[PDB]
Design a binder for these strands. Structure first.
Length: 88
DNA sequence: TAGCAGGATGTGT
DNA sequence: ACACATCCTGCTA
């Protein structure tokens, strides 16, 4: 079973030493993160899944599919490149 | 420019 | 079934 996108995102967020210039917690407790380097996050996701055509347009389309699943959501005050984990 | 909401359909297990 | 990936239009900062 391939890694899921939400888990992949949590993985990058776990190690700011390695990935902090690409993606970071804005509010760790509330699960609010910012994508700082969208092209880079998409590039890393494409490598992980072996989709060399992956880009942020398509990565973010998959994040949006999470809205109705209650996995990721946009924060109360919506901001570009800012997202929020619903649970843990 | 670049990101964002969500439909339709292709891909691979 | 499931989780995307890949196309799309229209919308928004």
């Amino acid at each position: 079973q391939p890694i899921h996108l939400w888990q992949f995102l949590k993985e990058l967020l776990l190690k700011p030493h390695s990935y902090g210039r690409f993606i970071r917690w804005l509010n760790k407790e509330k699960g609010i993160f910012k994508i700082e380097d969208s092209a880079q996050v998409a590039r890393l996701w494409g490598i992980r899944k072996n989709r060399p055509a992956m880009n942020y347009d398509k990565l973010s389309r998959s994040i949006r599919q999470y809205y109705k699943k209650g996995i990721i959501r946009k924060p109360d005050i919506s901001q570009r490149l800012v997202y929020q984990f619903v649970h843990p």
